[PDB]
Amino acid sequence: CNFPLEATWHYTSYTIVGALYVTWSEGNSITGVPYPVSGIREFSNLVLNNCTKYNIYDYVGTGIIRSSNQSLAGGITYVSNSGNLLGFKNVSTGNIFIVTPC
């Protein structure tokens, strides 16, 4: 599939210049990143206490994340029966985070 490259002179005339071609297959080996992160050995980001957009273990949405601590024995993802994050446990440790819709 492709992305046509178009040219115009002040949006009067329009013509195609060329195109960018891309192939792909679905899966989870390669991830796009918003900017050229450097220095960091393992990439993640977490903002607390006011609205964010998040991508957390493939759950995507918006809201406010706050830290807490409860004896949540079990896995690392907690969701509603509508598929929305209620919270998550930060894998390497026992800290848990609560996710709310601002």
């Binding site: 679905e26 899966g27 989870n28 273990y57 079990g74 896995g75 690392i76 993802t77």
Partner: protein
């Protein structure tokens, strides 16, 4: 190894992963097709470069 190759109920699967070809499950219940019936099981096997 139990009769018919079952893993004993109550075992903790300390380092046993589910195999995948793509995505992974994190939390939930489902029917899987996985290499979990044993014909053998060899403890602390003694594998060396001479094996």
């Amino acid at each position: 190894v139990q009769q018919d190759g079952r893993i004993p109920n109550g075992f903790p699967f300390n380092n046993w992963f589910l195999l995948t070809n793509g995505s992974t499950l994190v939390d939930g219940v489902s029917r899987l097709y996985q290499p979990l019936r044993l014909t053998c099981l060899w403890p602390v096997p003694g594998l060396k470069s001479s094996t």
